[PDB]
């Protein structure tokens, strides 16, 4: 009847890890050149029982490594001719053009660690996940950088999922993951060699697909705001990299007017430009001017970065933080460690 | 595999019962280079931690053991629950979380007890 | 609150600060919770404010934890209080 | 190497004598990638089985041991032979084969004995 | 004087294993193509003491794996143009010719297992082997398929060894392993392009070698049947793949009349044919017709599959079970596991 | 024993069976232990029997454990008993 | 790492103190293919020697232990020094070198003592 | 108060090892061909505390392995046309010329062993080193063979270090390691095709560098012999391989008159010769005659092998033992093993 | 010591020996400690002795542990004692 302290070894109790993951992945392309020495060949090839875990995508740490490895890749591979760091410091580089087409990479746990995965389709957010499994490696993610539309990512399993740390507040973004992709075809045709045009381009979006998609999004948004009509608007202002929709294909820096999407095919007017701001930190960079021949991007719109007005309701596109883009894919994973030692009350005593 | 008994997902009581059964059955007998090496590195680390822990536990008088009974009484202020409430309804994760802030106190006491007993025995 | 109230036709500058110097994302808002100006990624982001065509910042100072907000062509009608939502703090200042 | 004493090919008595001698001497101190990895995989498995077995044996009160003496008497019906007949003339293979069908009975008894002793000790 | 039960760990007691072995082995040839991904590079490089073990070649299990791996190799590599499975189901395939020349492969034990080998030259059979050693890998075996004569296998160390589960009964075959090989040269010369000949071929066997070999075989057979004259005969009937001697070189399916061997060089008349029965199971297959140019096989007769008449004595060639062919090489090996735990009576007691 | 005895000029069929459906090798023999018909590998093998030129089977049934034996142009002189040496069993049937 | 306590470079007394502290902290929780394989081969060997030694030491009654106390008295002729002179001022290397020629004598005595005790216990 | 015997495991006590080290290292060149199968790829990448160790370069054993591996390399790679072993035995070989340019190799410890390194710049000799660290692998050493001058080796960190087992005795050599290298350029120019010249060559040594170097050496030698003027002399006699300075580049065997160095640039007269004595053991060998085109060696004089007169003092160059050359680089390393078990007096007793 | 003393105009041979047969390096010296003749590596090395132009050895015997020393055109003025510093021994012989 006397209660005593006893100790057990092999107790399966988890704590969050602070470790570093390794990269695994699969012709001079810069990501392939990098991967050649940066990543290992991939793994050629476990649901847990009645467990619950509080995954929190906005407070994760897998993100910092992803957002350090990509800057290193990018900065080494895409050299500006002029790079200005703020006094100021200006350096220059040789500027050959390079092939640029992002490839998937996987993050994998080092010895002693494992990655928890949330398998709940109706993920919702930072609340408890009641469907948890374990892996060594995450699925492959293409480190695509873009601003208003999230391109070439994964799709929601069944329904559009709106994930936001605080929907009500509006000082935070809303990440919308689509359960369907919308195809977009962007190109700069030949016979556009004028100086006053090599910097002009256009994009085609299926009219029906876009309209079907927004109707589905609105039906989901109305759950939070059931008494209001939802109106989409264009951007408010600020740096051009985020005012309009920016992306990069073939090494060229593209900007597109998305007003017609948030106001046959829908045609957007796009431009290519030599002077850009950096996303790597505060500063500017100049890249060598465009080349001749037809240029084309082919992509899947898989999501949106939206914000909502404060004080009928209005939403508009925005973005600029590559970390937000990384979260949209890494939200399902957490890395943990095991501390195999515990204490419990018992009903025995040591002979003394 | 540090989770020798596989208790994540079930309560502690069930885990102990499962061990007894499995131990009985076991005694009774009832890219390919890269991942090849990584698979072993993981096992070697786990072995080393295991062997290490088994002797570190001698500080509390529990070396060479998976389960070790004490001479330090439970302080009810650390839980105020019965044996069956804890062993039948809680998982190890729930349990350690419940008492997460008394760990250093308890470990300290276990060391102290072991020291006193060693002293007493050498005095004779 | 802190008060830095100017007059119609002026230019004013307010500084919000961070203690960790992480170029933390932040947003400047009025009492009606309208986003005016903030730090999104490494970029300057504006909201649908009456100040959208007048306000600016100092990007190079974000690395020092300094997030100044400059309003050019200030009107007395812009008199309000605003919040520096930088890190944990929610400092209120009148302009 | 699970055959720690190397007894296949010799009788049990000789194996025990050999151990004593070798243990004394030891204490006293008296393609290349593919097969490289396979050679280690084999050792890692053997280590894991060893460590596992050493604690599984606690069910009979014999953990952390190579050799463990009991409180369960031998039932002559299982052999009807003397100690020297068995230890001097039979190899381990011959011996286990001779008593191959009493194994579960014996293991059961060993578990029972251990349970009863643990019970008796905690009662005090 | 009181006898007690005691337990020892590390007890070297063997049990037969039920595990799966891996393949190791050494230009588009089908076996090399297969081996490229199916087998590992071979091992660049132990007699036991006074032990005895009952090896049983007719009850082994290494055979099933060999006879699963070869079917998989073969079926993937030698595509029939028409394959009929019995109702019936008929499928077709593209039929390029392929190079076909069997190479040796080795079977090797996985972690936790070892292979016992019998080193007794006078092996005899399923009785106890008094000469036992251990290996990880077997010697290499070429998976040659043939019917009446066993080709390109190993030779007996000293004397012809006759191995049969039950010699007396005759419902079982007799596998004869020679201690000498007899060379056979089979070919289809050029300038044989007639339609009514591309399907004709012949084989030469040294007269003396054949006659010397049979005299040696008979002297050994007479040990079982000392009062009878031994007469060899030709086949009795049944499927042509076994009535005559069948084999395959270069992908072509050859048939030879062995009557002159069981009735300068001895010349046999041979044919090449497009429609064959399968050895993989019950069914038929058509293969593309023969090609032009001289075709040659070069082989070592290393053994025979013989049967004996029931009710002077008569023997004849036969065969058809590739498992019998596999046994002729795998009879020396057994795979086992160790159960390092035992019980013995002792003369000590636990303090209680 | 089982008896299935026909007359001169008939055709008869006897079925031997296996319980495991493994297309097991088997051999059919007379009382003088002469191999008549069997399953060798996947092939039909005949022995030096008087039935060598008359007997047959059903190959597709071997996979179902059915090993029928068909004798065409049966003679009364073939009257004998025979054994189905299939698996463990040694069933005797008169034909 | 066989030098579990890291004593090369410091005296024995300090090493023992260091162990107590570190053990507490640990319990408390306070070319790439070639060298990859070689790094593991080294660890596997060390583990095997460790496990082996831990049971070999049973010959002196010290199996499953890092530290083991005896019933064999020290013969002053082997050193003629005090406990603090040795433990506070000498490193393990200096110490073993000082007594390098009495090793076999001592090991022999330890075996003998263990034998006698086992005999005495089984007599009861 | 009773003193007892106690035993500890994990006691860090060292003993010298007798093991074998493995080679690691980095176009048909003979050392590269050898290394391809003889050495592993190198390691892409620990000072001890208050420890002291008696390193003894003249009694080491790393040397024997180095002097077995090099003979094997050399003998396999540089075939004499005629090789005479003393009765006598004479064999011959094909004699293609080979590329010959020594590369660095590293010696590395096998599992269970480690190599101690002395980091004391003022190494001095066999006395105790008070600065000790551990490595798996040594630095790379080029197995250069030469007689009077030690070429292409390492330099002393600060000052010329004179290492000799017994300076006073003179039956032993003096190895002088320089803290500066002196460049020497040796060549056989084109347009030297005469028969009575293809075997003539010359070397240039900077006058100032040589003179500066000797002044520094003498200042150091005077520490041992402070009351005597030091005079350098030429060799005394004996086998030509050591009487003059011998070396090998490109496979050719060169001999140089060093008298002008021990008596703008200093020019030495050199010759190339076909019949040489062996350093591998007692015997002789003939190599194929010289080739056409300009031949050049480029090297760093890093040390000297000197001897001193017995009974003003005189020193002269000499050499001939490749083991002495090996010691000049291996003196910093020792290989040891750990015996993790010790005994100490204590103040506790076992309960009995 | 051992004495092997010849006369002016003679040729003499002395043999120094090793017990291990290792072709050990060795050096022959006079009483004034002048190196005369030795084994350096596999080569014959001479010292600055009056015997430098007269002495020789037998290289093929070094492998048998035999280190003979031959002095041609011996003078009585060379009468001295010499040391066989071979292995551990320092044998003294008069010539
Ligand atoms: C979303 O995912 C999709 C799928 O991964 C991404 O779409 C790919 O985008 C890349 C961008 O370059 C595009 O690559 C081109 O494919 C063409 C197919 O024939 C190639 O011909 C072309 O090569 C030429 O341009 C390269 C530019 O860097 C040169 O490096 C290369 O040498 C070639 O250059 C020749 O032609 C040019 C003509 O202007 C001439 O000036 C040169 O001198 C030379 O003659 C590229 O490889 C992929 O095909 C796209 N994939 C698909 C399926 O269409 C998409 O970009 C992702 N979205 C985002 C935003 O990343
Ligand atoms: C017992 O072991 C021995 C030794 O392993 C086996 O003997 C070998 O059998 C193979 C069977 O093909 C034989 O291979 C031929 O060797 C010739 C040597 O010069 C090759 O020239 C010939 O290549 C031609 O034929 C191939 C047929 O598949 C083609 O794939 C290949 O491209 C070549 O084809 C050219 O010539 C033909 C001429 O008819 C023409 O039609 C084509 O268009 C093309 O021009 C084969 O490689 C080995 O040489 C044999 N080994 C020896 C030592 O003789 C033996 O078969 C084993 N026994 C059994 C039953 O397996
Ligand atoms: C100290 O270290 C330095 C640095 O490692 C060593 O110096 C190197 O010594 C090698 C000796 O050969 C020398 O190699 C030559 O470099 C030349 C540079 O252009 C090459 O052209 C030359 O190649 C020719 O000669 C080779 C002789 O074996 C042939 O094998 C080869 O095929 C080439 O032969 C052509 O030219 C000859 C002309 O006579 C002609 O007969 C042939 O038919 C054919 O046409 C060698 O590679 C290195 O360059 C030296 N390094 C430097 C920096 O100069 C130095 O030797 C070390 N000291 C010692 C004593 O080892
Ligand atoms: C009751 C009871 N007592 N012991 C057990 C039990 C049941 C199953 C397994 C184990 C056990 C014990 C020690 C180790 C391991 C193990 O899995 N490894 C060794 C350490 C490194 C990883 C591999 C399992 C005990 O039930
Ligand atoms: C006091 C006191 N008691 N034990 C320790 C202590 C402190 C640190 C480490 C260890 C220890 C014990 C056993 C093993 C190991 C170890 O490092 N390995 C296991 C054997 C193979 C190499 C790895 C460490 C004990 O302090
Ligand atoms: C869903 O996300 C919102 C975001 O703030 C969070 O508050 C809520 O608790 C989440 N619910 C679940 C079940 O995860
Ligand atoms: C984009 O191009 C693909 C190419 O097959 C085409 O199928 C798709 O409909 C295009 N979409 C638009 C909107 O042009
Ligand atoms: C829509 O886009 C496709 C893409 O090629 C194009 O062919 C089609 O003509 C476009 N049609 C209209 C009406 O926009
Ligand atoms: C030899 O093989 C026969 C085959 O049945 C078997 O009966 C006999 O016992 C075997 N003898 C030995 C010694 O293996
Ligand atoms: C026997 O075969 C060889 C094989 O080439 C042939 O040359 C020889 O002529 C043949 N001789 C007879 C007589 O059959
Ligand atoms: C320096 O080397 C000489 C060579 O004999 C040796 O006697 C002396 O003790 C050494 N001194 C030190 C400090 O190593
Ligand atoms: C010294 O050597 C260099 C090497 O090329 C040569 O150019 C120079 O003329 C030489 N000078 C004298 C005076 O020896």
Residue numbers in the entry:
A (entry chain D), E (entry chain G), H (entry chain A): 32 to 57, 62 to 80, 84 to 124, 197 to 306, 325 to 359, 361 to 392, 412 to 459, 465 to 505
B (entry chain E), D (entry chain H), G (entry chain B): 519 to 548, 567 to 660
C (entry chain F), F (entry chain I), I (entry chain C): 1 to 95
Source paper text:
HIV fusion is facilitated by the viral envelope glycoprotein (Env), a trimer of non-covalently linked heterodimers (gp120 and gp41) (Harrison, 2015; Lee et al., 2016). Here, we identified a pocket in gp41 of our previous cryo-EM reconstruction of an early pre-fusion intermediate Env (CD4 bound and co-receptor mimic antibody bound) (Ozorowski et al., 2017) that is proximal to the FP and contains a bound detergent molecule used during cryo-EM grid preparation.
Compared to assays in which sCD4 was excluded, one small molecule, GO35, stood out, as the change in Tm of three Env trimers was observed only in the presence of CD4, suggesting that the ligand is specific for the CD4-bound conformation. Using single-particle cryo-EM, we next solved a ∼3.5-Å C3-symmetric reconstruction of a complex of B41 SOSIP, sCD4, and 17b Fab that was incubated with GO35. The N-terminal portion of the FP is disordered until residue I519. The piperidine ring of GO35 is located deepest in the pocket, although the density supports only weak hydrophobic interactions with the environment of I519B, L520B, Y586B, A582B, V583B, and L587E. On the other side of the central biphenyl is the oxadiazole ring near the entrance to the pocket, and it may form hydrogen bonds with the peptide backbone of the FPPR. Remarkably, the experimental binding mode of GO35 overlaps substantially with the position of DDM in the model used as a reference and with minimal deviation from the predicted binding mode (root-mean-square deviation [RMSD], 1.7 Å). The full FP from the DDM-bound conformation would potentially clash with GO35 as the FP folds back on itself, bringing A512 and V513 very close to the biphenyl core of the small molecule. This finding suggests that the binding of GO35 biases the FP toward the more disordered state and may force the trimer into a less stable conformation, as trimer dissociation was apparent in the cryo-EM 2D class averages, with an estimated ∼60% of the selected particles classified as individual protomers.
